[PDB]
Swiss-Prot record, chain C:
<protein>
    <recommendedName>
        <fullName>Large ribosomal subunit protein bL34</fullName>
    </recommendedName>
</protein>
<keyword id="KW-0689">Ribosomal protein</keyword>
<dbReference type="GO" id="GO:0006412">
    <property type="term" value="P:translation"/>
</dbReference>
<keyword id="KW-0687">Ribonucleoprotein</keyword>
<comment type="similarity">
    <text>Belongs to the bacterial ribosomal protein bL34 family.</text>
</comment>
<dbReference type="Pfam" id="PF00468">
    <property type="entry name" value="Ribosomal_L34"/>
</dbReference>
<feature type="region of interest" description="Disordered">
    <location>
        <begin position="1"/>
        <end position="44"/>
    </location>
</feature>
<dbReference type="GO" id="GO:1990904">
    <property type="term" value="C:ribonucleoprotein complex"/>
</dbReference>
<dbReference type="InterPro" id="IPR020939">
    <property type="entry name" value="Ribosomal_bL34_CS"/>
</dbReference>
<dbReference type="GO" id="GO:0005840">
    <property type="term" value="C:ribosome"/>
</dbReference>
<dbReference type="GO" id="GO:0003735">
    <property type="term" value="F:structural constituent of ribosome"/>
</dbReference>
<dbReference type="InterPro" id="IPR000271">
    <property type="entry name" value="Ribosomal_bL34"/>
</dbReference>
Length: 121, 87, 44, 50, 111
RNA sequence: ACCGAUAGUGAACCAGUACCGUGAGGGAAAGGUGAAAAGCACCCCGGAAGGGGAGUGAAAUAGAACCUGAAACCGUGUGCU
RNA sequence: UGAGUAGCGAAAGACGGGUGAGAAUCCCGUCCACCGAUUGACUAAGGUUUCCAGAGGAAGGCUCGUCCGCUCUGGGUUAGU
């Protein structure tokens, strides 16, 4: 691996799946410096599967994404697998990498760690 | 006689008035049969049944000195006719 | 780990109560010494 | 291993020569007008220009 | 002349307070405010309020301009200690000291 | 030709009280504004505690943690090194 | 003085929205996680108001706290079987 983030092997990969899913549902989250440095690889590799749009690519993405429901506006409820292959994948058909960005904020109270903003470009 | 001491007006007793149930504070050493015969001679009301319960002193401290409150005996009386007309 | 003290209301009154101290000649002397001392609690 | 002798206040002050903190390293933000951390956003308006 | 502000019996140890105080001595009024707002210490919010309250006195009780002000004095004293206890092993206990400090800030126009 | 708050009764304060023990039993620490409460109206910084003015008072570093206020110990600035 | 040193008492959390002067630690929602001959449901002894609602943040909580078995104000235990 790259870095362990003070977690066991089984529970580290479960946290990365939750972080990747949340960055698709809301497209903008705030978290720790170290965690966001490695969510880039997970999220950006997942959009690559979405652009291909194959059945083998869709089943290879269903083993990383969680099961949630999208409901923000008045339209029909949608999943997270459907959103990635239907909305995100159509905004990067002409882009080669660099689907995410990181912006630093500063140290937070009570912990001393710095928070950052990661979002889809 | 003067078995009854004070009436009780609380949030739970207000909804108990709709069922013709009145809450009074009684003497510590009396039974509900005595309380039954005390309402009928003061308000001239026919009663149906009487409930009663006992409490315990509460440790309340104000300032620097600790102490206890008085033990309380509370009775609930059910009326079939009339009304006590508490002001 | 079982400890030495296991409280019980009945035992505390039948061994150290007022009527137990009044039932023997040497128990009345205990109450007299505490009365002379001025204790707020004469017996358990 | 207990200390053998009492530590004088001359040794204690010498030891704390390097026990200190420094300034965060702030720079002026040419949108807000007040200082901000380098490579970070301006807390008053959230402008990480450039 | 000099204006001052004092805060008494703050639940912070005096040794930890003096770390931030040495970063503002002789600084500009705006520089001192900026330094205290960008450090992630425990005493930074507390000291800043004492400085901002000392500047308000210099602008109201006296006819000064708050653009040439400098920090002339900044020190922390100690106050009464709160003595607690903590149970250790083998049935004994150890003492715990909760210390307090008095924070003072002085701003001077100059002259 | 006895003590003057570590003294004098254990107890000058609501002390055989707190508290400790199953029980018999053991057993503390704590006095002081000012002559008079006249106990800071009002203005400024906060969420508050606190502080700076004004005012009462002979005195407010006598502001209720309040008569004087030593030492240990902890901080700031300076002449010589 | 030791010294800003040892320790902070078995363990899986992540993000969105609010409250707020101040939020990793408080509320609401989603996902993931742990026990399930028991960390689930009753009741005897023992404790004696720790139970409920509305307010508060000095001290207690081995951190923070807008929260609490903590403070203030009011309430709560109903038998011929």
């Amino acid at each position: 691996g790259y870095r362990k983030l003070g977690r066991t092997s089984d529970q580290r990969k479960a946290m990365l799946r939750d972080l990747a899913t949340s960055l698709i549902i809301s497209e903008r989250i705030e978290t720790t410096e170290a965690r966001a440095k490695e969510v880039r690889s997970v999220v950006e590799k997942l959009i690559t599967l979405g652009k291909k749009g194959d059945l083998a690519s869709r089943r290879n993405a269903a083993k990383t994404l969680r099961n949630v429901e999208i409901l923000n506006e008045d339209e029909t409820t949608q999943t997270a697998l459907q959103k990635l292959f239907g909305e995100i994948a159509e905004r990067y058909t002409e882009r080669q990498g660099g689907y995410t960005r990181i912006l630093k904020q500063g140290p937070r109270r009570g912990d001393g760690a710095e928070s950052v903003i990661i979002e889809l470009v | 006689r003067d078995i009854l001491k004070r009436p009780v007006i609380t949030e739970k007793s207000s909804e108990a008035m709709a069922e013709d149930k009145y809450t009074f504070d009684v003497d510590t050493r009396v039974n509900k049969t005595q309380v039954k015969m005390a309402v009928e001679e003061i308000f001239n009301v026919k009663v149906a049944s009487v409930n009663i319960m006992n409490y315990k002193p509460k440790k309340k401290r104000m300032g620097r000195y600790q102490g206890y409150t008085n033990k309380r005996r509370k009775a609930i009386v059910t009326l079939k006719e009339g009304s006590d007309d508490l002001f | 780990v079982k400890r030495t003290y296991q409280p019980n209301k009945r035992k505390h009154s039948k061994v150290h109560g007022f009527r137990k101290r009044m039932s023997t000649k040497n128990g009345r002397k205990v109450l007299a010494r505490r009365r002379r001392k001025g204790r707020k609690v004469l017996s358990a | 291993a207990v200390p053998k002798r009492r530590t004088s206040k001359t040794r204690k002050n010498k030891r704390r020569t390097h026990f200190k903190i420094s300034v965060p390293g702030m720079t002026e933000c040419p949108n807000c007008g007040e200082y901000k951390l380098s490579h970070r956003v301006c807390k008053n308006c959230g402008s990480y220009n450039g | 002349m000099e204006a001052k502000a004092v805060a008494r019996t703050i639940r912070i140890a005096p040794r930890k307070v003096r770390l931030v105080l040495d970063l503002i001595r002789g600084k500009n009024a705006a520089e001192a405010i900026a330094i205290l707002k960008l450090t992630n210490k425990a005493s930074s919010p507390v000291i800043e309020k004492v400085l901002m309250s000392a500047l308000a006195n210099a602008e109201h009780n006296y006819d000064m301009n708050t653009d040439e002000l400098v920090v002339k004095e900044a020190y922390a004293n100690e106050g009464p200690t709160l003595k607690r206890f903590r149970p250790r092993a083998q049935g004994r206990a150890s003492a715990i000291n909760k210390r307090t400090s008095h924070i003072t800030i002085v701003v001077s126009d100059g002259k």
